[PDB]
Amino acid sequence: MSDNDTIVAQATPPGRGGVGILRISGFKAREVAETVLGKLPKPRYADYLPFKDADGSVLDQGIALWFPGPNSFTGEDVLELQGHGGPVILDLLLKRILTIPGLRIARPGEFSERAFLNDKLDLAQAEAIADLIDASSEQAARSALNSLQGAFSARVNHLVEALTHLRIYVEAAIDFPDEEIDFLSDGKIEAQLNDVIADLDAVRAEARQGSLLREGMKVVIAGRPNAGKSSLLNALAGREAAIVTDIAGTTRDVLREHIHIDGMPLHIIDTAGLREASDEVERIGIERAWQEIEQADRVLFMVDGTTTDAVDPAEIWPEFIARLPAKLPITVVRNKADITGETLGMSEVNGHALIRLSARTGEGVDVLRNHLKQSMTNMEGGFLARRRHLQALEQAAEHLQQGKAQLLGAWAGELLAEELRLAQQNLSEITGEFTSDDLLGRIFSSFCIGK
Amino acid sequence: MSDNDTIVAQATPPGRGGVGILRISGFKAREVAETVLGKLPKPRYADYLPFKDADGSVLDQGIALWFPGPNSFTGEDVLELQGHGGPVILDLLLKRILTIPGLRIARPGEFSERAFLNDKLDLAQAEAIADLIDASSEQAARSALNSLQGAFSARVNHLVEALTHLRIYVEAAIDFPDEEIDFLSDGKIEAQLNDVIADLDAVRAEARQGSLLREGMKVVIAGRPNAGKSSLLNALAGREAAIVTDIAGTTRDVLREHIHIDGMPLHIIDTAGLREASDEVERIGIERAWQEIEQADRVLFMVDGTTTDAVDPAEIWPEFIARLPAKLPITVVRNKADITGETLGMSEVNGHALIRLSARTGEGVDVLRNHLKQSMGFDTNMEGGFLARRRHLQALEQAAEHLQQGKAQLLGAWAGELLAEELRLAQQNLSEITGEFTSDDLLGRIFSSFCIGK
Amino acid sequence: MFYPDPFDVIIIGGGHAGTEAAMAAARMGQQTLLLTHNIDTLGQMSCNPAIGGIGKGHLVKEVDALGGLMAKAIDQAGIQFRILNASKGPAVRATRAQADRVLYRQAVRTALENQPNLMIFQQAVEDLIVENDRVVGAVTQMGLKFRAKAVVLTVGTFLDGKIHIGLDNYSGGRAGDPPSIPLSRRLRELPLRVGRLKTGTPPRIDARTIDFSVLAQQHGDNPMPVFSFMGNASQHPQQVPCYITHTNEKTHDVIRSNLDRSPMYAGGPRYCPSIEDKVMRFADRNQHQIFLEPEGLTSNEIYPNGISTSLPFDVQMQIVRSMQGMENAKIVRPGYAIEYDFFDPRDLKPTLESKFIQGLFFAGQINGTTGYEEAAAQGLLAGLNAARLSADKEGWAPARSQAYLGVLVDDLCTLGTKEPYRMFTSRAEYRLMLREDNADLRLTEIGRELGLVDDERWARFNEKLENIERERQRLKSTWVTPSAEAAAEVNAHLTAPLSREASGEDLLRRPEMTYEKLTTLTPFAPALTDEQAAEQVEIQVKYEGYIARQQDEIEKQLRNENTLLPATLDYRQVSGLSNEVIAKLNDHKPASIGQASRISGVTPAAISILLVWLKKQGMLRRSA
Amino acid sequence: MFYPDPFDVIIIGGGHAGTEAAMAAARMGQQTLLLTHNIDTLGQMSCNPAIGGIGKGHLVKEVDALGGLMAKAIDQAGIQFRILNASKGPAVRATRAQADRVLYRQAVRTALENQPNLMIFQQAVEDLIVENDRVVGAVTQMGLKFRAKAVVLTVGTFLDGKIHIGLDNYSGGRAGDPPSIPLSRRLRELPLRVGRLKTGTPPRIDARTIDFSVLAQQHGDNPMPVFSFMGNASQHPQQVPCYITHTNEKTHDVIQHQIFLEPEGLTSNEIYPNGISTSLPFDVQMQIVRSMQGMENAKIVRPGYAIEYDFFDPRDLKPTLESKFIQGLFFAGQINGTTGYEEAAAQGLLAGLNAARLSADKEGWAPARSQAYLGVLVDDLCTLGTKEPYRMFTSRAEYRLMLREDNADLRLTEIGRELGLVDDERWARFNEKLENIERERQRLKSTWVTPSAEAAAEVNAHLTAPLSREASGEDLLRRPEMTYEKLTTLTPFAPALTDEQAAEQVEIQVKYEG
């Protein structure tokens, strides 16, 4: 992972747009340029050519700019490709790029690093470069918790545990061949290897079916029952989603709807009205909505004008404010203004927006939309977040493949241990770090080695 | 909007990023270049230079491209100014650009509009630009891009040229009534019409296969409360889609989820258990569920294996069979089959598929997925293909109707003029997708739906 | 008071690391002083009388290749020799010796008594001298004090040790030795953090009260191996066997019944050191393996391996008297544990120098380790660095890629755990190239650069390297074809007969074939007589691909390896780093960006931000 | 809290008295236990590595005659032997040797570790169990206590001792050996007598800093003498010479005397300066060592020191070395105000003999001044009660011709067989020697010669006052100029006994009948 690695990353923001940018800066920049374009165009010239594949088909048509160093953003061999801002086509192109040996995806804000330490960028903004990296890394880490969040994050746990068990039983009888542990060193080891491989396929087939990612920035609307949660969601969606009545706790199951706003996707989440639940369904729905709240990105706490004129979110529901994560931005909506008559518009309360609108008729709907877009969302939304997992898991099956083949020859356990360690190192990029000391701890706890 | 009026619009998706690119086209582009740049760089040269404010203060730094027409995306003089993905600065730059008289934020689709107004490509290729910037599946995106390559326009042009040749032959025959009957009875006209009918039918079948992956289909899970339909949908989804418990009436609201069994789209719809409950909300939910069944392309039935061994639809619940309109495929799935221990697999009762499986354990979900995949007309046998639109299907139906009416008239009444008129009308309808005859209203309505700045 | 001669380096405590430090410093041409508690204890083994093992023989071979004494005192004091993992790959083998004790002690003392430039002195130490973050001089007990340009402490386990048996205790460095009390307080006052650890040993049986007539035997090995790269098998004394026995349910019953009397339980590493732990942790097992080994060929004491404990004397006697062949047995030395002070290795540079004080070094037990072989390497490195400093030259420290010592130092600096540090083969990430047979191949030259290797070793290594290169070139100069006149046998006894131009170099690429087999043939003429050099060609040919992969991987981290971080850095003065990471780094105080990256809790984002900060302050010439 | 099995005799401290006491007790046929600080320090010499000499040689011979251990170990740990005053008569003759410390320690440990009826336990003791003025077992430092029927105390110089150096000192039994402070406190309850004494050693120079080309060597006698009556000269190790160096006036100024540089081992690099002992600080010691020929630039490895200890004078124990105040507890060794190794080994042997006799419920035996040098020593010490540490000299034994070191076996080994201290191989060799001497004496007395004999001419030539009347072999030998070899080398007096020891004994008897 030297500073000479050729990396591939996306420059344009996630979402819908007419242009998408993929940039490459490294030694293999010329290699990638020849691989994708099958040639090298005139330097610093707005050349034109489509994106072909190994099979010969075209993945996209656009404009390519090749910038040899040092007169570039990062002062190195930098390749820029411009096409169409389609998330699926972008993912296909990135997958095409990554199969080349020696390539890897960039980390949060790596190009700032490269263009900074090569002295291709001014030096005054060190304090700003110290944040453009941290924010990107934090958002990337926040993501991928949706990548491994369903049943998919149930087969990887199985794979990791099986590999750990195999390594415990394969590495113990290379380091403690003087105790009584009745190691599995016999041929059955290879049998226990097979299932592990047979397990990996399952994981690789788990994400090939199910939901459809649906990239975007999440949003949450909640409150007490009969507070307008149904009406607000219906108005935002533009079509009927949930029933509208005066019955307390009318809706009991969470609802998710998708809406685009001038090329900036957002996802609307509906939840049952917050209150004390006297029913199993109500209590479980309250728990589900509460759990979805923390993972949310933007929230609009319900503030019914009829109930009271209190504006401070803390005063209205101090417990809810306290429970909320600190970083979570909060917006205030004063519902039912058309009956209360409070003037429509955008207002700020203690640094948080206080908005009065008529949900029952649509008054003030634009103002909330105006705030939402004006609020912002850096990168790493979905498709790119799950590419890291499918890549790390990708470059561990081949490790096992080339490790198992060794057994067919002379049975040397050191090479098997090496390959298994490499495979677990590549798997650690998904779940977590598994150091050489943790394996020893598990071995100690599993056997009676002692002394 | 006005072609003479120079336009400016933002291209990249909103938010933040490395590059926020503004695209400007019109006759004021060169003048706007000097105001913001004070110089005209060599066209198609990736020149690094600053951006100049009205006061002269350095607005920003980036990449500026000057593309004089017609060797551009729209054929006019278009300036491609690339800076940084800083939305704050982009607002200032766009305000400065709009300040100069003669500039205005062009309406959505204008970039596709004017480039279409100059006959750069086929009209339907403009819509092909969309449906690919926002797709749902990898297969759908690849098919949309392949169509964007312009394959469908080739078929439409070939069909229209064949129709034009047939029209020429028919008119030549009609101009000589003495030999017009002999020309019609020669058999060449009938052979040409039959071959054109066959090719049009094949293309319409492929189009039907097209737009199949745009949305796939709608399946409705109908059954009694606590039958497990929420559980089956949750298993199909692969997550915690809905709430599952032993309490009756576990679900009331209509639940929609978008999934892909294998490289295909589909919308599985859940519903509330069919029972008569005093709850007004539950009654409304039952109303909604009964509303959606007619819309769905297919329907399946989930019934507890222990509750009743009846497999024929009438025995399970004679009310639902009568209420549901006929002509809709229906399948019965035996949930909780593990307690019954029934052999798991695909079965047919009363000519309808019957399936046994348990949601909680997950056994039998794979066979359910395979049945859903195979029952709906689709497969991986044909790739590339073509992606269509509702308007395309309507135009194809009208063209087929015109051709059939023309052939019927030729066979029965032997009316050469009527057949020629029908053929010409069918040719115009077929070309409607090509835009030669389509009115400007349809073009504007289609282009408006595009995102701003496209 | 002040002695009238200034030395270069002063070693305090001639245990297992002090002797190595003194030998290295003296052989490196610097006047060296060795202050010791008492003589005739030089080379004493206070625990299991064995040398080597898995992860220990590697350290012993490193010490030998650098010009040490550990591997030369066991060739003449060992009574049993074995090779562990003989059937597996060469990269994981080990050598273990059951060593006679008196012979080892005499050999060590004689070797250390006749070293030029080195002087020994018998005295205790009660304080040190420091002014302006510098250590100059040490104070003994009589009153005489010495001045030196560098000091090295190897106190071991004597820093205020306490012997515990049952629920009672008394002061003691070990069984029969006094405690070094005052120096504990004196070192405590310094800007240091000190803690305690504890470990025990079993009793000693009388070899003439055990009915060895019904106990299974365990022998040594035919053509027995050696440790040093110089000696041979003609130097080993007569060998002796070991006796194997087991336990039974009565012993478990007694242990469980009397478990109440114990400092633990009653009212800890991740394994089970004692025997009561062995039973309680795994209560279903109803049998355990016990070894009885002779402490020498002139003494009738038997060391029981496997039955260490902390229970009172009565339980010890009952456990002894409840095993087959031990019905009527005598104990001459009771088992016991000891608790001793130690320093955390997060305030000493990778060269085993205290990051705060100047000239002070640490080695041996006080570095939070355990074992003979874990102290000799530390002492050798500390003495080397002390001599280099006192001579005003740049120090030296190995990397994780060229010595187990590098792994040991790096882990002891950046681990943070609490277990006593034991070396294991899998504990190093470069096993495939950090073998034993090649130790000199990768270390001796460095010693010659620093003057740690004399002429005999130099000549031997040069001859061996010439043999290796000649064999490689000659094997590279062969070629065969399927129609070869002698190819009949080659295809007959080799699978997949020749189908094109062949070569011995490519011939060996098959896994089934061997080196001697290929040698036994008209082509590929008789192999060289020195098979010790011959094995290297086989290892290289069979491990070339993995070696190349590891080599190109190693070369890429070198920039982070070089990038240093001064101990005066204040990470609170960096923008963009989380509070927790700031606290972690401020506590650890790494020496390079790579070593920090090896910490747990620091991710690549933190290192990127740190690099950006470095480029801003100019604290780096470049990072490439 | 109590050991499962009992014991017959208990010996405290494995020093020089302790080893002999334990060996004797085990040999006599009882069960004994030896309590020691550290096993790896059994057979340690804390001073000059020399044995024997004037007085210190008779005791070793007597101990060997009683079937001991010291002589058989010095026979294998000695690198230089000599006879002092070989010109004089046998009365004042003596032998000496230089001991290799490693070899002597190994011999002692190995010999003492392979004895039947003997058990060794390593645990410092702290108290004794006495009830109704009776001794039964003692407790240790770790809590465990044993029970036995008799106890012998040989604590030594570790009882409340302090190591002095220059103008300072610190507590401790020795240089690097902790003392048994609590032990002495317990014994103080009895009304007894307390005495103090101080001792020290010189430094230990390094052999690599001395010049061995300008110094005079000093070897030993060629036909290497032996100590044990049951040994020979093939057991001795390699022989090495000593060195002679002379002081200078500057030494006396700082504070002619020829000094000996005794090698302190056959595989060591230390040197023992005999005659530099003092209580001076390290600076003074360095200055003094730098004031002798060939030692201009030399270094000290083990700095010297002096120590003081505590003891109870041997005026409160019976002639059997048993505490009069306390039954079942004897006294022997350094704790009785004595120094040296020979002076303590005999006391330990006697104490072990008495303790084993008492344990078996029989009677002990205190040697006599008319029979044993060890008996003379014990009498002079105990009966006098003197606080002065007795030192063995030839002068104090007026019965010189009888109490020689040459005939200790004749007067003690036969007596030893009764108590059981003597073994079968010994007994057999002793009986053979006695029979040979008797036969030779009678044959000599049964031979007669007259001046008429043919050999009378040479007899008169070799003898003053030529033949005058009838003569016998013994009468002829009684002439001062006559010699055993000359008597053998004659036509009469056929080949003499090939047993050299018997020949010397018969010569001594014939010439000292008076």
CATH code for the domain in which residue B354 is found: 3.40.50.300
Residues of B with Cβ-Cβ distance to A18 under 8 angstroms: 11-12, 23, 111, 133, 451, 453-454
Closest-CA distance of chain A to residue B45, Å: 5
Task: Yes or no: say if A307 and A344 are a contact pair by the CB < 8 Å rule.
Answer: no
A200 with A274, same domain?
no
Please classify residue D451 by burial: count the beta carbons closer than 10 Å to its beta carbon, then call 0-12 exposed, 13-18 middle and 19+ buried.
Answer: middle
| Candidate from A108, A117, A440 with C-beta closest to C623 | A117
Q: Are the Cβ atoms of D282 and C330 closer than 8 angstroms?
A: no
The residues in D 162-191 lying below 8 A from C, measured between CB atoms, are 165-166, 168, 170, 175-176, 178
Closest-CA distance of chain D to residue C130, Å: 25
| Candidate from A110, A171, A409 with C-beta closest to C426 | A171
Cα A202 to Cα B362: distance, rounded to the nearest angstrom: 15
Q: What is the largest CA-CA distance in chain B?
A: 85
Could you state, in order of their start, the residue ranges of all structural domains in chain D?
9-201+307-419, 204-305, 424-511
Q: Which residue of D has its CA nearest to C164?
A: D142
- Encoding tokens for residue A68? 């040899």
| Candidate from A130, A413, A441 with C-beta closest to C576 | A130
Q: Are the Cβ atoms of B281 and A245 closer than 8 angstroms?
A: yes
User: Is B129 contained in some domain?
Assistant: no
Q: Which residue of D has its CA nearest to C169?
A: D142
Q: Are the Cβ atoms of A17 and B19 closer than 8 angstroms?
A: no
Architecture of domain D204-305: Beta Barrel (2.40)
| Candidate from C119, C144, C176 with C-beta closest to D299 | C119
The residues in B 1-30 lying below 8 A from A, measured between CB atoms, are 11-19, 21, 23
Q: Decide if D40 touches C, using CB distance below 8 A.
A: yes
Residue B70, preceding peptide bond in cis (omega within 30° of 0): yes
Tell me: is residue B407 an annotated ligand-binding position: no
Cα B299 to Cα B327: distance, rounded to the nearest angstrom: 11
Judging contact as 3 or more Cβ pairs under 8 Å, the answer for A and B is: yes
> CATH code for C204-332?
2.40.30.260
Beta bridge partners of C83: C95
B256 with B290, same domain?
yes
Chains contacting A with at least 3 CB pairs below 8 Å? Answer: B, C
Angle between helices D70-77 and D58-65 (to 10 degrees): 120
| Candidate from A2, A113, A413 with C-beta closest to C608 | A113
Please classify residue A278 by burial: count the beta carbons closer than 10 Å to its beta carbon, then call 0-12 exposed, 13-18 middle and 19+ buried.
Answer: exposed
A46 with A88, same domain?
yes
Q: Are the Cβ atoms of D166 and C142 closer than 8 angstroms?
A: yes
Q: Are the Cβ atoms of D303 and C178 closer than 8 angstroms?
A: no
Given strand D151-153, what is the order of strands in its sheet? D118-122, D32-36, D9-12, D151-153, D329-331
Strands C118-122 and C32-36: parallel
The CATH number linked to B88 is 3.30.1360.120
Closest-CA distance of chain C to residue A420, Å: 12
B305 with B241, same domain?
yes
Half-sphere exposure (CA, 13 Å, Cβ side) for B223? Answer: 28
- Residue of C33, C34, C36, C40 to mutate when probing chain D, most D C-beta within 10 A: C40
Q: Are the Cβ atoms of A209 and B238 closer than 8 angstroms?
A: yes
Residue C247 CB partners (closer than 8 Å, separation 6+): C287, C288, C290, C319, C322, C323
Q: Collapse the DSSP code of D50 into the 3-class scheme (helix H, G, I; strand E, B; otherwise coil) and give the result.
A: strand
Q: Are the Cβ atoms of D122 and C178 closer than 8 angstroms?
A: no
Range of the domain at A28: 7-122
- Encoding tokens for residue D60? 């070793």
Cα B112 to Cα B9: distance, rounded to the nearest angstrom: 13
Q: Decide if B369 touches A, using CB distance below 8 A.
A: yes
The residues in B 278-317 lying below 8 A from A, measured between CB atoms, are 280-281, 284-285
Resolution (A): 3.3
> What superfamily in CATH does domain C9-160+344-450 come from?
FAD/NAD(P)-binding domain (3.50.50.60)
Cα B208 to Cα B202: distance, rounded to the nearest angstrom: 10
CATH entry 3.30.300.30 includes domain D424-511: no
Residue for token pair 């690094």: B48
> What superfamily in CATH does domain D9-201+307-419 come from?
FAD/NAD(P)-binding domain (3.50.50.60)
User: Is B367 contained in some domain?
Assistant: yes
B312 with B270, same domain?
yes
Residues of C with Cβ-Cβ distance to D166 under 8 angstroms: 142-143
Cα C305 to Cα C291: distance, rounded to the nearest angstrom: 5
Residues of A with Cβ-Cβ distance to C581 under 8 angstroms: none
Q: Collapse the DSSP code of B317 into the 3-class scheme (helix H, G, I; strand E, B; otherwise coil) and give the result.
A: coil
Task: Yes or no: say if A13 and A380 are a contact pair by the CB < 8 Å rule.
Answer: no
B237 with B317, same domain?
yes
Residues of D with Cβ-Cβ distance to C296 under 8 angstroms: none
Cα C506 to Cα C390: distance, rounded to the nearest angstrom: 52
Residue A87, preceding peptide bond in cis (omega within 30° of 0): no
The Cα-based distances of A10 to A82, A107, B138 in angstroms read 10, 11, 19
Q: Are the Cβ atoms of B259 and A92 closer than 8 angstroms?
A: no
Closest-CA distance of chain B to residue A366, Å: 18
B221 with B370, same domain?
yes
- The runs of H, that is alpha helices, within C262-355 are 276-281, 313-320
Judging contact as 3 or more Cβ pairs under 8 Å, the answer for B and D is: no
The Cα-based distances of D361 to B306, D20, D255, D327, D357 in angstroms read 98, 21, 58, 13, 6
Stretch (H or E) spanning D26:
helix D16-27
Q: Are the Cβ atoms of C575 and A415 closer than 8 angstroms?
A: no
* Cβ-based contacts under 8 A for chains A and C: 127
Q: Which residue of C has its CA nearest to A124?
A: C616
Beta bridge partners of B266: B259
Task: Yes or no: say if C236 and C210 are a contact pair by the CB < 8 Å rule.
Answer: no
- Encoding tokens for residue C378? 């530390």
- The runs of H, that is alpha helices, within D420-453 are 424-445
The residues in A 164-223 lying below 8 A from C, measured between CB atoms, are 171, 174-180
Q: Which residue type is seen at A172?
A: A
Cα B134 to Cα B151: distance, rounded to the nearest angstrom: 20
Q: Are the Cβ atoms of C559 and A178 closer than 8 angstroms?
A: no
Q: Are the Cβ atoms of D176 and C176 closer than 8 angstroms?
A: no
Residue for token pair 């576990």: B250
Q: Decide if A248 touches B, using CB distance below 8 A.
A: no
Residue A285 CB partners (closer than 8 Å, separation 6+): A252, A253, A254, A271, A272, A277, B243
Q: Are the Cβ atoms of D122 and C168 closer than 8 angstroms?
A: no
Q: What is the largest CA-CA distance in chain C?
A: 88
CATH entry 3.30.1600.10 includes domain C558-617: no
* Total of domains in chain A: 3
- The runs of H, that is alpha helices, within B298-389 are 313-316, 318-323, 337-340, 365-375
B224 with B362, same domain?
yes
Residue D471 CB partners (closer than 8 Å, separation 6+): D448, D449, D450
The annotated binding site of C for NAD(+) is made up of 268-282
The CATH number linked to B394 is 1.20.120.430
The annotated binding site of A for GTP is made up of 226-231, 245-251, 270-273, 335-338, 358-360
Residue for token pair 């007994």: D427
Task: Yes or no: say if A333 and A357 are a contact pair by the CB < 8 Å rule.
Answer: yes
Which CATH fold topology does C471-553 show? Arc Repressor Mutant, subunit A (1.10.10)
Q: Are the Cβ atoms of C142 and D113 closer than 8 angstroms?
A: no
The Cα-based distances of A400 to A194, A269, B204, C428 in angstroms read 10, 42, 49, 21
User: Is A245 contained in some domain?
Assistant: yes
Please state the φ and ψ torsions of residue C381, each to the nearest 5 degrees. Answer: -65, -40
Q: Are the Cβ atoms of A412 and C272 closer than 8 angstroms?
A: no
Task: Yes or no: say if C570 and C603 are a contact pair by the CB < 8 Å rule.
Answer: no
Report helix, strand and coil shares of chain D as percent, to nearest 5. Answer: 35, 20, 45
Cα D43 to Cα D341: distance, rounded to the nearest angstrom: 10
Closest-CA distance of chain C to residue D35, Å: 10
Q: Decide if A319 touches B, using CB distance below 8 A.
A: no
B221 with B286, same domain?
yes
D437: number of Cβ within 10 Å = 20
User: Is B97 contained in some domain?
Assistant: yes
